Amino acid sequence: RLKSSCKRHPLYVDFSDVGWNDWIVAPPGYHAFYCHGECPFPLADHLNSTNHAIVQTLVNSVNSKIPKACCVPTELSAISMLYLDENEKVVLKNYQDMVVEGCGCR
Amino acid sequence: SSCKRHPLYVDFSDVGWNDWIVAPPGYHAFYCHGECPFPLADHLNSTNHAIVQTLVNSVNSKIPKACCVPTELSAISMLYLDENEKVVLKNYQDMVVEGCGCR
Ligand SMILES: *[C@@H]1O[C@H](CO)[C@@H](O[C@@H]2O[C@H](CO)[C@@H](O[C@@H]3O[C@H](CO)[C@@H](O)[C@H](O[C@H]4O[C@H](CO)[C@@H](O)[C@H](O)[C@@H]4O[C@H]4O[C@H](CO)[C@@H](O)[C@H](O)[C@@H]4O)[C@@H]3O)[C@H](O)[C@H]2NC(C)=O)[C@H](O)[C@H]1NC(C)=O
Ligand SMILES: *[C@@H]1O[C@H](CO)[C@@H](O[C@@H]2O[C@H](CO)[C@@H](O[C@@H]3O[C@H](CO)[C@@H](O)[C@H](O[C@H]4O[C@H](CO)[C@@H](O)[C@H](O)[C@@H]4O[C@H]4O[C@H](CO)[C@@H](O)[C@H](O)[C@@H]4O)[C@@H]3O)[C@H](O)[C@H]2NC(C)=O)[C@H](O)[C@H]1NC(C)=O
């Protein structure tokens, strides 16, 4: 469980495991990766952070009760999925912000 | 109970930025705090990814829940003292939280 800095980790999400395959016709699953890692003090530019996150991580080093910045998706991409409308017609809809492209500390 | 914006006044003398920052003496930075419940309900400024992570978390604990982080940020202007001892007016983007959400 060793501490590491904020980055992107792989995650394949199979819809049958989540019970979504009842409504989603395709795909069976997708590579939706996830963000995880520590956002150290002082936080870097290269960690895709905001001035607020630099300030909050600083406030934490003085008051531990205030959390540091979370490692979160900063850049997301879309995926197309198929579903069945009311009259059994197949529909193709683009789902915004489904895949993590880059992580960052916020 | 859930993800919301909470007030956080940031005083520079308490933070140690007193030396380089001339004005203001601090500012109302605000901070995000709260639960990202399962299943993710409306009005929480979430992404579809956050809904997906949240649901995978309920089936696999190794995968964390979505974090409550700032989703909208505004700027503040500051007066700072540079290397040459001249007091400079600068704009600092993304300093104040305007809205929180589950990401
Ligand atoms: C800070 O944020 C930045 C910005 O987000 C992060 O840097 C970005 O990093 C990602 C890669 O991790 C990158 O996105 C790629 O762009 C390339 C452009 O040429 C593509 O080659 C690449 O496509 C593959 O991956 C995508 C999913 O990530 C898929 O949509 C696609 O099908 C491609 O897949 C290949 O590899 C996979 C392996 O999983 C395989 O399954 C595929 O079939 C195929 O072999 C990405 O779209 C950006 O280019 C980066 N931008 C910059 C400016 O560097 C940065 O790392 C963040 N910091 C932290 C700490 O996370
Ligand atoms: C989901 O995200 C949305 C989008 O971010 C969030 O909705 C926004 O919420 C904000 C914050 O309340 C709100 O922004 C205000 O707009 C007001 C007009 O409607 C302005 O009055 C206000 O400006 C004041 O506060 C700022 C900081 O927020 C200051 O920098 C500024 O100087 C202003 O100061 C006034 O009020 C303060 C009290 O804090 C006082 O000291 C001063 O004397 C002065 O009276 C904000 O900019 C947006 O209007 C919302 N947008 C929409 C579309 O609804 C939403 O809350 C999120 N959900 C969660 C859970 O976070």
Mutate to test the interface with A, among B10, B11, B33, B49 (most CBs of A within 10 A): B49
Q: Which of B46, B15, B59 is nearest to A55 (CA)?
A: B15
Cα–Cα distance between B6 and A16 in angstroms, integer?
A: 38
Q: How many helices (H) and strands (E) does chain A have?
A: 1, 7
For chain A, first and last CA: distance in Å? Answer: 22
Distance B98 CA to ligand 2 centre (A): 5
Domain count, chain A: 1
Helix (H, G, I), strand (E, B) or coil at B65: coil
- Asked whether A56 lines ligand 1 (CB < 6 A), one says no
Asked whether the CA dihedral B41, A36, B72, A95 is positive or negative, the reply is negative
Contacts of A70 (CB under 8 A, 6+ apart): A39, A105, A106, B67, B68, B69, B103
Approach to solving = X-ray
Task: Give the C-alpha separation, A36 to A70, whole Å.
Answer: 8
Q: How far is B2 from chain A (nearest CA, A)?
A: 16
The range of the structural domain enclosing residue B63 comes to 1-103
- Region of A88 please: left (phi>0), alpha (psi -120 to 50) or beta: left
